[PDB]
Amino acid sequence: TIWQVVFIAFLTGFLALVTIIGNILVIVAFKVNKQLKTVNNYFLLSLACADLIIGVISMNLFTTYIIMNRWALGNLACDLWLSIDYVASNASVMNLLVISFDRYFSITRPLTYRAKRTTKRAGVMIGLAWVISFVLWAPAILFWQYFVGKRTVPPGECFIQFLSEPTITFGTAIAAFYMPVTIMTILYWRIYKETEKMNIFEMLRIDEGGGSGGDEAEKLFNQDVDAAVRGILRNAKLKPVYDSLDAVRRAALINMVFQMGETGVAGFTNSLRMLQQKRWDEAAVNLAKSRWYNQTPNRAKRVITTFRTGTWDAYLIKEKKAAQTLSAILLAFIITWTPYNIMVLVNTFCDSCIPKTYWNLGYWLCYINSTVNPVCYALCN
Ligand SMILES: C[N+]1(C)[C@@H]2C[C@@H](OC(=O)[C@H](CO)c3ccccc3)C[C@H]1[C@@H]1O[C@@H]12
């Protein structure tokens, strides 16, 4: 009847504005605050831009196609709305690929990539993403009916002409969803597994606020770490303490030797006794009331915490939070776009087995994915 139409228009209207509000609020928080324009947060701007377009146009136009059950906007308004919807969502999956590429190279190759992530290279990746999405859809939707010589799409309805064949649509489905999802699936596991994955060499790197050095600097750094341990073994007051410590707290001991020298570390008599006597809680308070905690508090606070917990929980707080963001992003993407692509996968091997009702619900389900992304920004960061 029409009673369900009213309810349909209310629910679809609610999701339209809340997507827009969420996206606009993100952009304002990017243009105002100069502390949110980072490398990874710059890619979240392109996502907020693409999702905003869908919320203001695609969400508003596709609703009328369901309500009136007919397209009454013309032929020039049809091919444009499809181009807008397909380019923005294609730039969207390109943005997600760039986001997933940044974290994968920052973990796998932290020596020759972490110091290469600039704003210049970030602006190009986004710029190219929007251009590539344009070349693949705009001519294929606008200038395909002319190459044929006629418009296959009948008046009153609206759909892409070159995607009439289920075979082509399926091929489009794989390269565009199945292939990026499987890639981002492999990347995410590589990032989540290589979380720790944490040695002394990188431990010092953080405390120094240090950066990735050359290939030769790694040869010298290893010799310095190896020679530091030899000095601890030579030391008659450090050797018994160092030997009783585990591989995690051993490195934390070298952290102080690298800083204050072997002799300076040997000063903490009461602390070293507590470390050998497995009294971690008492040594943490003890090391926090020295001159070392007052000279370099942030460096000490991470070393002291390493002693207390016995884990690398003081050097992964920024990296684990970076994985929680991507986890919330790809989860919403594979839970919404999948039921549509499942149908595309199925529709390829049959004729009439998937109702237009399910194609509509499968279509609208992907729209709300653009709404979760602004929420994931306030749910993680
Ligand atoms: C708005 N949608 C609902 C349409 C259908 C789906 O997209 C797809 O599944 C296909 C590939 O399977 C696709 C279309 C365009 C761009 C990339 C993929 C989700 C989004 C996307 O803009 C389209």
Can you give the length of the chain in residues? 381
Put residue 156 in one of left, alpha, beta given phi > 0 → left and psi -120 to 50 → alpha: left
- Check the CA dihedral 42-330-21-33 and report its sign: negative
Read off the CATH number of the domain in which 219 is found: 1.10.530.40
Clarify whether residues 85 and 11 are in a common domain: yes
Q: If you ran DSSP here, which 8-state letter would residue 354 be given? A: S
Q: Are 60 and 16 in contact (CB under 8 A)?
A: yes
CATH number at residue 339: 1.20.1070.10
Domain that holds residue 123: 3-195+321-379
Alpha-carbon 338 to chain mean position: 19
CA distances from 271 to 40, 206, 265, 347 (A): 41, 24, 10, 70
Whether the CB-CB separation of 277 and 312 falls below 8 Å is answered with no
Closest to 238 (Cα-Cα) out of 254, 227, 225, 224? 254
Q: CB-hemisphere CA count at 13 Å for 352? A: 0
* Measured distance CA(362)–CA(217) in Å, rounded: 54
List, in order, residues 6 or more apart from 184 with CB less than 8 Å away.
Answer: 96, 97, 100, 330
62 and 142 together in one domain: yes
Cα 40 from chain centroid (whole Å): 8
Spatial CA neighbour of 148 closest among 156, 140, 136? 140
Contact 343, 362 (CB under 8 A): yes
The answer to whether 70 touches 156, Cβ cutoff 8 Å, is yes
Same domain for 161 and 90? yes
The answer to whether the beta carbons of residues 103 and 43 sit under 8 Å apart is no
What atom of ligand 1 comes closest to residue 364's alpha carbon?
A: 3
Q: Are residues 300 and 327 in the same domain?
A: no
Count Cα neighbours of 141 within 13 Å in the Cβ-side half-sphere.
22
Neighbours of 136 (CB within 10 A): 16
Q: Is the CB of 163 under 6 A from ligand 1?
A: no
Distance CA 176, CA 96 (A): 12
Query: Which residue's CA is the closest to the ligand 1 atom numbered 15?
Result: 86
Q: What are phi and psi of 29, to 5 degrees?
A: -75, -10
262, 235 Cβ separation under 8 angstroms: yes
Residue 55 CB contacts under 8 Å (≥ 6 apart), including other chains? 16, 17, 19, 20, 23, 367, 370, 371
Could you tell me if the CB of 363 is within 6 A of ligand 1? yes
Expt. technique: X-ray
Q: Using CA atoms, how far apart are residues 354 and 344, in angstroms rounded to an integer? A: 9
Q: Is 92 in the pocket of ligand 1 (CB under 6 A)?
A: no
Q: Is there a contact between 367 and 323 (Cβ–Cβ < 8 Å)?
A: no
Query: How much helix, strand and coil, in percent to the nearest 5, is found in the chain?
Result: 75, 0, 25
Q: Of 266, 285, 309, which marks where a domain is finished?
A: 309
Domain count, the chain: 2
CB 305 within 8 A of CB 313: yes
Mark which of 250, 285, 309 sits at the end of a domain: 309
Tokens of 357: 């009702």
How far apart CA 279 and CA 247 sit, in angstroms, is 17
The one-character DSSP state at 195 is T
CA distance 174 to 344: 10
Domain assignment present for 316: no
Show which of 309, 338, 363 is a domain's final residue: 309
Q: Strand runs (DSSP E) across 266-308, as ranges?
A: none
Q: Is the domain of 170 the same as that of 123?
A: yes
Contact 8, 66 (CB under 8 A): yes
- Whether 51 contacts 19, CB under 8 Å: yes
Among 15, 94, 167, 340, the mutation site with the greatest number of ligand 1 atoms within 8 A of its Cβ is 340
User: Contact 99/191 with Cβ under 8 angstroms?
Assistant: no
Contacts of 221 (CB under 8 A, 6+ apart): 201, 213
What the block records as the tokens of 307 is 């002693």
In 3D space, the residue among 266, 254, 262 whose CA is nearest the CA of residue 201 turns out to be 254
Question: CB of 336 closer than 6 A to ligand 1?
Answer: no
Residues sharing a CB contact under 8 Å with residue 367, sequence separation 6 or more, in sequence order: 15, 19, 54, 55, 58, 59, 62
Closest CA to 61 of 83, 46, 45: 83
Pocket residue to mutate for ligand 1, from 51, 53, 86, most atoms within 8 A of Cβ: 86
Residue 285 lies in a domain: yes
